[PDB]
Amino acid sequence: PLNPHVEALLQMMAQMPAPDFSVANPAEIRAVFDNLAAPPQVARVENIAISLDGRDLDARLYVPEDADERPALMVYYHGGGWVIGTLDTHDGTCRALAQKSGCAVLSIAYRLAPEYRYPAPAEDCYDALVWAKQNAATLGVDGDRLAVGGDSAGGNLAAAVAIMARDRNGPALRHQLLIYPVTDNDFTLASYAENGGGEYYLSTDGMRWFWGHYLGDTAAENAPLAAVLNVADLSGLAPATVITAEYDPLRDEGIAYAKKLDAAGVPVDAATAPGMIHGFFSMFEAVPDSWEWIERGASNLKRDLALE
Amino acid sequence: PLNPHVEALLQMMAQMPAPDFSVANPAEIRAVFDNLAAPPQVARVENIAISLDGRDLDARLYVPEDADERPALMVYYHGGGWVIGTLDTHDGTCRALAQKSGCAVLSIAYRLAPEYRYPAPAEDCYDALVWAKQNAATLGVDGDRLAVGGDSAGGNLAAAVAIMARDRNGPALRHQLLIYPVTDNDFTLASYAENGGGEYYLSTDGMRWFWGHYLGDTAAENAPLAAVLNVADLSGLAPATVITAEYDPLRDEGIAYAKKLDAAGVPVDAATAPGMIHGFFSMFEAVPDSWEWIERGASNLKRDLALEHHHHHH
Protein backbone atom coordinates (compact mmCIF):
# COMPACT_ATOMS: atom_id res chain seq x y z
CA PRO A 1 0.00 0.00 0.00
CA LEU A 2 0.89 3.67 -0.14
CA ASN A 3 3.66 4.82 2.22
CA PRO A 4 1.86 6.43 5.20
CA HIS A 5 4.11 9.49 5.09
CA VAL A 6 3.44 9.84 1.37
CA GLU A 7 -0.28 9.57 2.09
CA ALA A 8 -0.03 12.32 4.73
CA LEU A 9 1.89 14.53 2.29
CA LEU A 10 -0.69 14.06 -0.49
CA GLN A 11 -3.43 14.86 2.01
CA MET A 12 -1.56 17.96 3.14
CA MET A 13 -0.98 19.05 -0.45
CA ALA A 14 -4.74 18.67 -0.97
CA GLN A 15 -5.65 21.11 1.82
CA MET A 16 -3.53 23.86 0.27
CA PRO A 17 -4.99 26.88 -1.58
CA ALA A 18 -5.73 25.96 -5.23
CA PRO A 19 -3.45 27.82 -7.73
CA ASP A 20 -6.51 29.26 -9.75
CA PHE A 21 -5.28 29.05 -13.37
CA SER A 22 -7.81 28.89 -16.21
CA VAL A 23 -5.76 26.69 -18.52
CA ALA A 24 -2.77 24.33 -18.49
CA ASN A 25 -0.22 26.14 -20.61
CA PRO A 26 3.53 26.04 -19.87
CA ALA A 27 3.76 29.38 -18.05
CA GLU A 28 0.93 28.38 -15.69
CA ILE A 29 2.27 24.91 -14.98
CA ARG A 30 5.80 26.30 -14.48
CA ALA A 31 4.40 28.78 -11.98
CA VAL A 32 2.49 26.12 -10.04
CA PHE A 33 5.53 23.82 -9.90
CA ASP A 34 7.87 26.66 -8.84
CA ASN A 35 5.49 27.54 -6.01
CA LEU A 36 5.38 23.93 -4.85
CA ALA A 37 8.97 22.92 -5.32
CA ALA A 38 11.29 25.92 -4.93
CA PRO A 39 12.21 28.13 -1.98
CA PRO A 40 10.96 31.72 -2.09
CA GLN A 41 12.54 33.47 -5.05
CA VAL A 42 15.21 36.11 -4.57
CA ALA A 43 17.54 37.70 -7.14
CA ARG A 44 20.81 36.72 -5.56
CA VAL A 45 22.12 34.59 -2.74
CA GLU A 46 25.79 34.89 -1.84
CA ASN A 47 27.75 32.74 0.59
CA ILE A 48 30.09 35.04 2.49
CA ALA A 49 32.87 34.27 4.92
CA ILE A 50 33.15 36.90 7.66
CA SER A 51 36.67 37.06 9.05
CA LEU A 52 36.58 38.56 12.52
CA ASP A 53 39.26 38.92 15.15
CA GLY A 54 39.91 35.35 16.31
CA ARG A 55 37.17 33.56 14.36
CA ASP A 56 35.52 33.21 10.95
CA LEU A 57 31.73 33.14 10.66
CA ASP A 58 29.78 31.81 7.70
CA ALA A 59 27.11 34.21 6.46
CA ARG A 60 24.61 34.43 3.63
CA LEU A 61 23.42 37.53 1.81
CA TYR A 62 19.99 37.54 0.21
CA VAL A 63 19.09 40.28 -2.26
CA PRO A 64 15.46 40.29 -3.34
CA GLU A 65 14.03 40.98 -6.79
CA ASP A 66 12.79 44.55 -7.28
CA ALA A 67 15.37 45.82 -4.77
CA ASP A 68 17.02 49.24 -4.75
CA GLU A 69 20.50 49.58 -6.22
CA ARG A 70 21.81 49.98 -2.67
CA PRO A 71 19.15 48.32 -0.54
CA ALA A 72 18.66 48.58 3.21
CA LEU A 73 20.04 45.64 5.21
CA MET A 74 18.66 43.46 7.96
CA VAL A 75 21.29 41.43 9.78
CA TYR A 76 19.46 38.22 10.75
CA TYR A 77 20.14 35.70 13.51
CA HIS A 78 18.67 32.19 13.21
CA GLY A 79 16.90 30.40 16.03
CA GLY A 80 17.73 27.05 17.57
CA GLY A 81 18.03 27.79 21.29
CA TRP A 82 21.64 29.04 21.01
CA VAL A 83 22.66 25.42 20.38
CA ILE A 84 21.29 24.24 17.02
CA GLY A 85 20.26 25.77 13.69
CA THR A 86 22.26 26.70 10.59
CA LEU A 87 22.19 29.00 7.58
CA ASP A 88 20.41 26.18 5.77
CA THR A 89 17.70 25.59 8.39
CA HIS A 90 16.70 29.25 8.13
CA ASP A 91 17.39 29.83 4.44
CA GLY A 92 13.69 29.72 3.50
CA THR A 93 12.80 32.10 6.33
CA CYS A 94 15.43 34.63 5.22
CA ARG A 95 14.31 34.39 1.55
CA ALA A 96 10.72 35.01 2.62
CA LEU A 97 11.64 38.08 4.68
CA ALA A 98 13.87 39.50 1.93
CA GLN A 99 11.20 38.94 -0.72
CA LYS A 100 8.41 40.63 1.23
CA SER A 101 10.48 43.52 2.64
CA GLY A 102 12.49 44.44 -0.42
CA CYS A 103 15.47 44.58 1.93
CA ALA A 104 18.73 42.70 1.71
CA VAL A 105 19.15 40.14 4.48
CA LEU A 106 22.50 39.01 5.89
CA SER A 107 22.11 35.75 7.84
CA ILE A 108 24.86 35.09 10.41
CA ALA A 109 26.14 31.68 11.55
CA TYR A 110 27.22 32.74 15.03
CA ARG A 111 29.14 30.27 17.17
CA LEU A 112 26.96 27.92 19.19
CA ALA A 113 26.69 26.73 22.78
CA PRO A 114 27.79 24.62 24.64
CA GLU A 115 31.02 24.77 22.63
CA TYR A 116 30.83 28.56 22.85
CA ARG A 117 28.75 29.58 25.84
CA TYR A 118 27.46 33.00 26.77
CA PRO A 119 28.62 35.61 26.02
CA ALA A 120 30.30 34.34 22.82
CA PRO A 121 27.20 33.91 20.59
CA ALA A 122 25.93 37.44 21.32
CA GLU A 123 29.38 38.96 20.77
CA ASP A 124 29.50 37.16 17.39
CA CYS A 125 26.10 38.58 16.48
CA TYR A 126 27.16 42.07 17.51
CA ASP A 127 30.54 41.92 15.77
CA ALA A 128 28.84 40.68 12.59
CA LEU A 129 26.57 43.73 12.72
CA VAL A 130 29.59 46.02 13.03
CA TRP A 131 31.33 44.14 10.22
CA ALA A 132 28.30 44.60 7.97
CA LYS A 133 28.25 48.35 8.66
CA GLN A 134 31.98 48.68 7.95
CA ASN A 135 31.76 46.56 4.80
CA ALA A 136 28.39 47.81 3.55
CA ALA A 137 29.73 49.14 0.25
CA THR A 138 31.45 45.81 -0.36
CA LEU A 139 28.17 43.99 0.28
CA GLY A 140 26.36 46.39 -2.04
CA VAL A 141 23.96 47.63 0.66
CA ASP A 142 23.15 50.90 2.44
CA GLY A 143 24.84 50.74 5.84
CA ASP A 144 22.91 53.75 7.09
CA ARG A 145 19.62 51.86 6.73
CA LEU A 146 20.28 48.97 9.07
CA ALA A 147 18.10 46.56 11.05
CA VAL A 148 18.50 43.42 13.12
CA GLY A 149 16.08 40.50 13.27
CA GLY A 150 15.84 36.92 14.45
CA ASP A 151 13.51 34.14 15.50
CA SER A 152 13.34 32.40 18.88
CA ALA A 153 16.89 32.45 20.37
CA GLY A 154 17.80 34.43 17.28
CA GLY A 155 15.24 37.02 18.32
CA ASN A 156 16.88 36.92 21.75
CA LEU A 157 20.20 37.64 20.07
CA ALA A 158 18.70 40.44 17.93
CA ALA A 159 17.28 42.07 21.06
CA ALA A 160 20.64 41.76 22.83
CA VAL A 161 22.45 43.24 19.82
CA ALA A 162 20.02 46.18 19.77
CA ILE A 163 20.96 46.80 23.43
CA MET A 164 24.67 46.32 22.77
CA ALA A 165 24.51 48.74 19.84
CA ARG A 166 22.82 51.41 21.99
CA ASP A 167 25.16 50.87 24.96
CA ARG A 168 28.31 50.81 22.82
CA ASN A 169 27.41 53.65 20.44
CA GLY A 170 27.42 50.96 17.76
CA PRO A 171 25.86 51.18 14.30
CA ALA A 172 22.58 53.11 14.28
CA LEU A 173 19.58 50.79 13.89
CA ARG A 174 16.24 51.64 12.29
CA HIS A 175 14.44 48.49 13.44
CA GLN A 176 14.58 45.25 15.41
CA LEU A 177 12.36 42.43 14.17
CA LEU A 178 11.78 40.02 17.07
CA ILE A 179 10.00 36.85 15.96
CA TYR A 180 8.69 34.82 18.94
CA PRO A 181 11.85 35.70 20.92
CA VAL A 182 13.26 34.08 24.03
CA THR A 183 13.44 36.88 26.62
CA ASP A 184 13.58 35.26 30.09
CA ASN A 185 14.07 32.01 32.00
CA ASP A 186 10.99 31.99 34.23
CA PHE A 187 9.35 28.67 33.32
CA THR A 188 6.37 29.15 35.65
CA LEU A 189 4.43 31.49 33.35
CA ALA A 190 0.94 30.56 32.17
CA SER A 191 2.36 30.17 28.66
CA TYR A 192 4.60 27.33 29.76
CA ALA A 193 1.73 25.47 31.40
CA GLU A 194 -0.68 25.92 28.51
CA ASN A 195 1.78 25.44 25.64
CA GLY A 196 5.00 23.85 26.93
CA GLY A 197 4.08 20.17 27.23
CA GLY A 198 5.61 19.15 23.92
CA GLU A 199 2.40 19.09 21.91
CA TYR A 200 3.27 22.33 20.09
CA TYR A 201 6.84 21.44 19.01
CA LEU A 202 8.79 23.59 21.50
CA SER A 203 8.60 22.32 25.11
CA THR A 204 9.46 23.74 28.52
CA ASP A 205 12.00 20.95 28.98
CA GLY A 206 13.52 21.97 25.66
CA MET A 207 13.98 25.53 26.88
CA ARG A 208 15.56 24.34 30.15
CA TRP A 209 18.04 22.33 28.07
CA PHE A 210 18.82 25.31 25.82
CA TRP A 211 19.26 27.75 28.73
CA GLY A 212 21.48 25.21 30.48
CA HIS A 213 23.89 24.89 27.57
CA TYR A 214 23.91 28.62 26.79
CA LEU A 215 24.68 29.79 30.32
CA GLY A 216 26.61 26.81 31.66
CA ASP A 217 27.60 27.69 35.22
CA THR A 218 26.97 31.40 34.67
CA ALA A 219 23.97 32.41 36.76
CA ALA A 220 21.26 34.14 34.69
CA GLU A 221 21.51 37.27 36.82
CA ASN A 222 25.17 37.55 35.83
CA ALA A 223 24.29 37.17 32.16
CA PRO A 224 22.40 40.45 31.56
CA LEU A 225 22.21 40.10 27.77
CA ALA A 226 20.64 36.64 28.06
CA ALA A 227 17.42 37.34 29.94
CA VAL A 228 16.91 40.67 28.20
CA LEU A 229 13.51 41.05 29.86
CA ASN A 230 15.32 41.73 33.15
CA VAL A 231 17.24 44.72 31.73
CA ALA A 232 16.02 47.73 33.68
CA ASP A 233 16.30 50.44 31.04
CA LEU A 234 15.06 49.71 27.52
CA SER A 235 14.81 53.36 26.50
CA GLY A 236 16.48 54.50 23.29
CA LEU A 237 16.38 51.12 21.54
CA ALA A 238 15.53 50.59 17.88
CA PRO A 239 11.81 50.65 16.97
CA ALA A 240 10.57 47.09 17.33
CA THR A 241 8.29 44.47 15.86
CA VAL A 242 7.42 41.72 18.32
CA ILE A 243 5.38 38.85 16.91
CA THR A 244 4.38 36.10 19.32
CA ALA A 245 2.41 32.91 18.68
CA GLU A 246 -0.76 31.86 20.53
CA TYR A 247 0.39 28.32 21.24
CA ASP A 248 4.05 29.11 22.02
CA PRO A 249 5.33 28.57 25.59
CA LEU A 250 7.48 31.67 24.97
CA ARG A 251 4.35 33.70 24.28
CA ASP A 252 4.02 35.41 27.64
CA GLU A 253 7.65 36.54 27.97
CA GLY A 254 7.56 37.92 24.42
CA ILE A 255 4.43 39.91 25.16
CA ALA A 256 6.11 41.15 28.34
CA TYR A 257 9.23 42.31 26.50
CA ALA A 258 7.06 44.20 24.01
CA LYS A 259 5.18 45.92 26.86
CA LYS A 260 8.43 46.86 28.61
CA LEU A 261 9.81 48.32 25.35
CA ASP A 262 6.69 50.38 24.69
CA ALA A 263 6.74 51.56 28.33
CA ALA A 264 10.30 52.78 27.84
CA GLY A 265 9.14 54.90 24.92
CA VAL A 266 10.26 52.55 22.13
CA PRO A 267 7.82 52.45 19.19
CA VAL A 268 6.53 48.86 19.07
CA ASP A 269 4.28 46.87 16.78
CA ALA A 270 3.30 43.85 18.82
CA ALA A 271 0.80 41.11 18.07
CA THR A 272 0.16 37.50 18.98
CA ALA A 273 -0.62 35.36 15.94
CA PRO A 274 -3.86 33.40 16.54
CA GLY A 275 -3.69 29.63 16.08
CA MET A 276 0.06 29.55 15.52
CA ILE A 277 2.87 27.63 17.21
CA HIS A 278 6.51 28.42 17.90
CA GLY A 279 8.48 28.41 14.67
CA PHE A 280 5.63 29.24 12.29
CA PHE A 281 7.62 31.83 10.28
CA SER A 282 9.64 28.90 9.01
CA MET A 283 6.55 26.79 8.27
CA PHE A 284 5.08 28.90 5.44
CA GLU A 285 5.21 26.01 2.94
CA ALA A 286 2.82 23.89 5.05
CA VAL A 287 1.05 26.83 6.68
CA PRO A 288 0.03 29.48 4.11
CA ASP A 289 -1.34 31.65 6.91
CA SER A 290 2.26 32.27 8.04
CA TRP A 291 2.73 34.55 5.04
CA GLU A 292 0.33 37.12 6.54
CA TRP A 293 2.66 37.52 9.51
CA ILE A 294 5.86 37.41 7.45
CA GLU A 295 4.33 40.27 5.41
CA ARG A 296 3.44 42.18 8.58
CA GLY A 297 7.00 42.03 9.88
CA ALA A 298 8.39 42.74 6.41
CA SER A 299 6.12 45.76 5.97
CA ASN A 300 7.39 47.23 9.25
CA LEU A 301 10.97 46.73 8.03
CA LYS A 302 10.12 48.33 4.69
CA ARG A 303 8.52 51.32 6.44
CA ASP A 304 11.29 51.99 8.98
CA LEU A 305 14.17 51.35 6.55
CA ALA A 306 13.02 53.74 3.83
CA LEU A 307 15.30 56.44 2.41
CA GLU A 308 15.15 59.71 4.32
CA PRO B 1 -8.47 27.40 17.47
CA LEU B 2 -5.18 25.74 16.62
CA ASN B 3 -4.53 26.47 12.94
CA PRO B 4 -5.68 23.42 10.89
CA HIS B 5 -2.61 23.46 8.67
CA VAL B 6 -0.47 23.69 11.80
CA GLU B 7 -2.31 20.74 13.33
CA ALA B 8 -1.60 18.66 10.20
CA LEU B 9 2.08 19.60 10.38
CA LEU B 10 2.17 18.63 14.07
CA GLN B 11 0.65 15.22 13.28
CA MET B 12 3.33 14.78 10.63
CA MET B 13 5.89 15.76 13.27
CA ALA B 14 4.36 13.28 15.72
CA GLN B 15 5.84 10.48 13.57
CA MET B 16 9.60 10.92 14.01
CA PRO B 17 12.28 11.47 16.76
CA ALA B 18 11.27 12.78 20.18
CA PRO B 19 14.21 14.86 21.51
CA ASP B 20 15.80 13.50 24.69
CA PHE B 21 16.58 16.42 27.01
CA SER B 22 17.80 14.09 29.76
CA VAL B 23 20.99 13.76 27.71
CA ALA B 24 23.27 16.75 27.11
CA ASN B 25 24.27 15.48 23.66
CA PRO B 26 24.40 18.60 21.45
CA ALA B 27 25.93 16.99 18.34
CA GLU B 28 23.04 14.50 18.25
CA ILE B 29 20.05 16.83 18.58
CA ARG B 30 21.93 18.97 16.07
CA ALA B 31 22.25 16.27 13.42
CA VAL B 32 18.57 15.54 13.89
CA PHE B 33 17.11 19.08 13.92
CA ASP B 34 19.44 20.51 11.33
CA ASN B 35 18.48 17.73 8.91
CA LEU B 36 14.71 17.84 9.23
CA ALA B 37 12.69 20.35 7.17
CA ALA B 38 15.95 21.72 5.73
CA PRO B 39 17.96 21.15 2.55
CA PRO B 40 21.09 19.03 3.20
CA GLN B 41 24.26 20.97 4.01
CA VAL B 42 27.07 20.99 1.42
CA ALA B 43 30.48 22.70 1.57
CA ARG B 44 30.30 24.84 -1.57
CA VAL B 45 27.48 25.85 -3.89
CA GLU B 46 28.29 27.99 -6.91
CA ASN B 47 26.14 29.35 -9.69
CA ILE B 48 27.93 29.21 -12.99
CA ALA B 49 27.20 30.00 -16.61
CA ILE B 50 28.04 27.49 -19.31
CA SER B 51 28.77 28.93 -22.74
CA LEU B 52 27.98 26.52 -25.54
CA ASP B 53 27.77 27.01 -29.30
CA GLY B 54 24.79 29.27 -29.85
CA ARG B 55 23.47 29.49 -26.27
CA ASP B 56 24.44 29.97 -22.62
CA LEU B 57 23.04 27.74 -19.89
CA ASP B 58 22.76 28.37 -16.18
CA ALA B 59 24.21 25.64 -13.97
CA ARG B 60 24.82 25.09 -10.25
CA LEU B 61 27.81 23.24 -8.80
CA TYR B 62 27.50 21.39 -5.48
CA VAL B 63 30.61 20.22 -3.64
CA PRO B 64 29.92 18.15 -0.52
CA GLU B 65 31.80 18.32 2.77
CA ASP B 66 33.99 15.23 2.47
CA ALA B 67 34.62 15.22 -1.27
CA ASP B 68 38.11 14.50 -2.66
CA GLU B 69 40.42 17.45 -3.37
CA ARG B 70 39.59 16.87 -7.03
CA PRO B 71 36.15 15.29 -6.73
CA ALA B 72 34.32 13.04 -9.14
CA LEU B 73 31.41 14.79 -10.86
CA MET B 74 27.85 13.83 -11.66
CA VAL B 75 26.21 16.08 -14.26
CA TYR B 76 22.55 16.25 -13.21
CA TYR B 77 19.41 17.00 -15.23
CA HIS B 78 16.29 18.09 -13.32
CA GLY B 79 12.89 16.60 -13.99
CA GLY B 80 9.78 18.44 -15.10
CA GLY B 81 8.54 16.64 -18.20
CA TRP B 82 10.98 18.58 -20.44
CA VAL B 83 8.72 21.63 -19.94
CA ILE B 84 9.05 22.76 -16.29
CA GLY B 85 11.59 22.73 -13.46
CA THR B 86 14.55 24.94 -12.55
CA LEU B 87 17.82 24.78 -10.65
CA ASP B 88 15.84 25.89 -7.61
CA THR B 89 13.07 23.27 -7.82
CA HIS B 90 15.72 20.57 -7.74
CA ASP B 91 18.27 22.21 -5.47
CA GLY B 92 17.25 20.05 -2.49
CA THR B 93 17.57 16.84 -4.52
CA CYS B 94 21.02 17.77 -5.80
CA ARG B 95 22.18 18.62 -2.27
CA ALA B 96 20.95 15.25 -1.02
CA LEU B 97 22.70 13.34 -3.80
CA ALA B 98 25.96 15.26 -3.37
CA GLN B 99 25.93 14.74 0.40
CA LYS B 100 25.23 11.02 0.24
CA SER B 101 27.61 10.31 -2.66
CA GLY B 102 30.65 12.39 -1.73
CA CYS B 103 30.74 13.52 -5.36
CA ALA B 104 30.37 16.98 -6.86
CA VAL B 105 27.09 17.55 -8.69
CA LEU B 106 26.64 19.96 -11.59
CA SER B 107 22.97 20.70 -12.14
CA ILE B 108 22.13 21.93 -15.66
CA ALA B 109 19.33 24.33 -16.63
CA TYR B 110 18.82 23.00 -20.13
CA ARG B 111 16.42 24.76 -22.52
CA LEU B 112 12.77 23.69 -22.17
CA ALA B 113 9.96 22.66 -24.49
CA PRO B 114 7.72 23.74 -26.22
CA GLU B 115 9.97 26.74 -26.86
CA TYR B 116 12.83 24.33 -27.57
CA ARG B 117 11.48 21.04 -28.85
CA TYR B 118 13.21 17.69 -29.17
CA PRO B 119 16.07 17.25 -29.72
CA ALA B 120 17.28 20.59 -28.36
CA PRO B 121 16.94 19.81 -24.64
CA ALA B 122 18.85 16.55 -25.07
CA GLU B 123 21.57 18.28 -27.10
CA ASP B 124 21.85 20.86 -24.32
CA CYS B 125 22.30 18.12 -21.75
CA TYR B 126 24.90 16.29 -23.85
CA ASP B 127 26.80 19.48 -24.74
CA ALA B 128 26.83 20.42 -21.03
CA LEU B 129 28.51 17.10 -20.23
CA VAL B 130 31.09 17.73 -22.97
CA TRP B 131 31.60 21.24 -21.56
CA ALA B 132 32.11 19.91 -18.03
CA LYS B 133 34.76 17.45 -19.23
CA GLN B 134 36.52 20.16 -21.26
CA ASN B 135 36.36 22.57 -18.34
CA ALA B 136 37.01 20.13 -15.52
CA ALA B 137 40.05 22.09 -14.37
CA THR B 138 37.97 25.28 -14.25
CA LEU B 139 35.32 23.48 -12.18
CA GLY B 140 37.99 21.93 -9.98
CA VAL B 141 36.82 18.37 -10.64
CA ASP B 142 38.22 15.11 -11.97
CA GLY B 143 37.22 14.98 -15.64
CA ASP B 144 38.10 11.29 -15.75
CA ARG B 145 35.50 10.36 -13.16
CA LEU B 146 32.19 11.46 -14.69
CA ALA B 147 28.59 10.35 -14.34
CA VAL B 148 25.16 11.56 -15.39
CA GLY B 149 21.87 11.41 -13.51
CA GLY B 150 18.40 12.86 -13.40
CA ASP B 151 14.85 12.36 -12.20
CA SER B 152 11.79 11.76 -14.36
CA ALA B 153 12.30 13.61 -17.69
CA GLY B 154 15.72 14.39 -16.27
CA GLY B 155 16.42 10.67 -15.98
CA ASN B 156 15.22 10.41 -19.57
CA LEU B 157 17.75 13.07 -20.55
CA ALA B 158 20.48 11.31 -18.54
CA ALA B 159 19.77 8.05 -20.39
CA ALA B 160 19.85 9.87 -23.74
CA VAL B 161 23.13 11.56 -22.84
CA ALA B 162 24.65 8.18 -21.94
CA ILE B 163 23.63 6.88 -25.37
CA MET B 164 24.91 10.00 -27.14
CA ALA B 165 28.25 9.81 -25.27
CA ARG B 166 28.70 6.19 -26.33
CA ASP B 167 27.73 6.90 -29.94
CA ARG B 168 29.77 10.08 -30.39
CA ASN B 169 32.86 8.81 -28.55
CA GLY B 170 32.01 11.53 -26.04
CA PRO B 171 33.24 11.70 -22.47
CA ALA B 172 33.66 8.34 -20.80
CA LEU B 173 30.93 7.82 -18.21
CA ARG B 174 31.26 5.66 -15.09
CA HIS B 175 27.59 5.71 -14.14
CA GLN B 176 24.10 6.83 -15.10
CA LEU B 177 21.68 7.37 -12.22
CA LEU B 178 18.12 7.10 -13.57
CA ILE B 179 15.53 8.12 -11.01
CA TYR B 180 11.95 7.14 -12.02
CA PRO B 181 12.83 8.00 -15.66
CA VAL B 182 10.51 8.59 -18.58
CA THR B 183 11.48 6.06 -21.26
CA ASP B 184 8.57 5.68 -23.69
CA ASN B 185 5.21 7.13 -24.74
CA ASP B 186 3.21 3.92 -24.52
CA PHE B 187 0.34 4.90 -22.28
CA THR B 188 -1.19 1.41 -22.42
CA LEU B 189 1.28 -0.13 -19.93
CA ALA B 190 -0.32 -1.49 -16.75
CA SER B 191 1.19 1.13 -14.42
CA TYR B 192 -0.61 3.90 -16.29
CA ALA B 193 -3.95 2.17 -15.68
CA GLU B 194 -3.09 1.53 -12.05
CA ASN B 195 -1.35 4.73 -11.11
CA GLY B 196 -2.11 7.41 -13.69
CA GLY B 197 -5.51 8.55 -12.48
CA GLY B 198 -4.21 11.74 -10.89
CA GLU B 199 -4.38 10.69 -7.26
CA TYR B 200 -0.62 9.99 -7.16
CA TYR B 201 0.81 13.42 -8.17
CA LEU B 202 1.64 12.45 -11.80
CA SER B 203 -1.20 11.56 -14.18
CA THR B 204 -1.40 9.85 -17.55
CA ASP B 205 -2.89 13.00 -19.05
CA GLY B 206 0.01 14.93 -17.55
CA MET B 207 2.48 12.71 -19.38
CA ARG B 208 0.53 13.06 -22.65
CA TRP B 209 0.82 16.86 -22.19
CA PHE B 210 4.57 16.75 -21.54
CA TRP B 211 5.18 14.38 -24.48
CA GLY B 212 3.13 16.60 -26.76
CA HIS B 213 5.16 19.70 -25.93
CA TYR B 214 8.52 17.93 -26.19
CA LEU B 215 7.96 16.25 -29.56
CA GLY B 216 5.68 18.81 -31.22
CA ASP B 217 5.28 17.58 -34.81
CA THR B 218 7.99 14.90 -34.54
CA ALA B 219 6.62 11.39 -34.37
CA ALA B 220 7.93 9.38 -31.40
CA GLU B 221 9.26 6.75 -33.79
CA ASN B 222 11.60 9.44 -35.15
CA ALA B 223 12.73 10.50 -31.67
CA PRO B 224 14.81 7.57 -30.36
CA LEU B 225 16.68 9.80 -27.91
CA ALA B 226 13.30 10.58 -26.35
CA ALA B 227 11.66 7.16 -26.38
CA VAL B 228 14.90 5.49 -25.32
CA LEU B 229 13.05 2.20 -24.70
CA ASN B 230 13.01 1.88 -28.52
CA VAL B 231 16.78 2.03 -28.97
CA ALA B 232 17.90 -1.30 -30.44
CA ASP B 233 21.37 -1.78 -29.00
CA LEU B 234 22.04 -0.69 -25.43
CA SER B 235 25.34 -2.56 -25.07
CA GLY B 236 28.42 -0.72 -23.78
CA LEU B 237 26.47 2.03 -21.99
CA ALA B 238 27.49 3.39 -18.59
CA PRO B 239 26.67 1.17 -15.59
CA ALA B 240 23.22 2.17 -14.37
CA THR B 241 20.99 2.57 -11.36
CA VAL B 242 17.27 2.54 -12.18
CA ILE B 243 15.01 3.31 -9.25
CA THR B 244 11.26 3.18 -9.97
CA ALA B 245 8.28 3.78 -7.67
CA GLU B 246 5.36 1.42 -6.95
CA TYR B 247 2.63 4.01 -7.41
CA ASP B 248 4.23 5.86 -10.32
CA PRO B 249 2.56 5.57 -13.75
CA LEU B 250 6.09 5.57 -15.22
CA ARG B 251 6.91 2.44 -13.20
CA ASP B 252 6.57 -0.15 -15.94
CA GLU B 253 8.51 1.71 -18.62
CA GLY B 254 11.32 2.29 -16.11
CA ILE B 255 11.42 -1.39 -15.19
CA ALA B 256 11.43 -2.23 -18.90
CA TYR B 257 14.41 0.03 -19.62
CA ALA B 258 16.34 -1.50 -16.71
CA LYS B 259 15.56 -4.96 -18.04
CA LYS B 260 16.85 -4.01 -21.50
CA LEU B 261 20.03 -2.48 -20.06
CA ASP B 262 20.72 -5.64 -18.09
CA ALA B 263 20.00 -7.85 -21.12
CA ALA B 264 22.52 -5.83 -23.14
CA GLY B 265 25.21 -6.63 -20.56
CA VAL B 266 25.18 -3.26 -18.78
CA PRO B 267 25.61 -3.65 -15.01
CA VAL B 268 22.32 -2.44 -13.47
CA ASP B 269 21.01 -1.93 -9.96
CA ALA B 270 17.26 -1.81 -10.48
CA ALA B 271 14.53 -1.74 -7.90
CA THR B 272 10.98 -0.53 -7.41
CA ALA B 273 10.48 1.37 -4.16
CA PRO B 274 7.41 0.01 -2.36
CA GLY B 275 4.75 2.50 -1.33
CA MET B 276 6.33 5.43 -3.16
CA ILE B 277 4.99 7.85 -5.76
CA HIS B 278 6.60 9.68 -8.65
CA GLY B 279 8.87 12.43 -7.40
CA PHE B 280 9.70 10.88 -4.04
CA PHE B 281 13.44 11.69 -4.16
CA SER B 282 12.48 15.33 -3.80
CA MET B 283 10.13 14.63 -0.90
CA PHE B 284 12.70 13.56 1.69
CA GLU B 285 11.75 16.27 4.20
CA ALA B 286 8.17 15.03 4.53
CA VAL B 287 9.01 11.41 3.69
CA PRO B 288 12.18 10.40 5.56
CA ASP B 289 11.83 6.92 4.02
CA SER B 290 12.96 8.54 0.75
CA TRP B 291 16.45 8.73 2.23
CA GLU B 292 16.95 4.96 1.96
CA TRP B 293 16.60 5.22 -1.80
CA ILE B 294 18.52 8.46 -2.15
CA GLU B 295 21.36 6.77 -0.24
CA ARG B 296 21.20 3.66 -2.46
CA GLY B 297 21.48 5.65 -5.68
CA ALA B 298 24.16 7.95 -4.24
CA SER B 299 26.04 4.92 -2.94
CA ASN B 300 26.07 3.28 -6.36
CA LEU B 301 27.47 6.54 -7.69
CA LYS B 302 30.20 6.59 -5.05
CA ARG B 303 31.14 3.01 -5.87
CA ASP B 304 31.53 3.52 -9.59
CA LEU B 305 33.20 6.94 -9.28
CA ALA B 306 35.65 5.61 -6.69
CA LEU B 307 39.05 7.20 -6.18
CA GLU B 308 42.26 5.49 -7.35
CA HIS B 309 44.68 3.83 -4.91
CA HIS B 310 46.86 6.09 -2.79
CA HIS B 311 49.23 4.91 -0.04
CA HIS B 312 48.95 6.80 3.27
CA HIS B 313 52.36 6.13 4.88
CA HIS B 314 54.32 9.33 4.17
Author numbering:
A (entry chain A): 2 to 309
B (entry chain B): 2 to 315
The authors write:
In addition to the core α/β fold, the 40-residue segment at the N-terminus forms a helix-loop-helix arrangement known as a CAP domain, in which α1 is almost orthogonal to α2 and protrudes from the main α/β fold. The putative catalytic triad, Asp252-His282-Ser156, is located at the C-terminal end of the central β-strands.
Structural analyses in this study have validated that EstDL136 contains structural features characteristic of the HSL family, with an α/β hydrolase fold and a CAP domain.
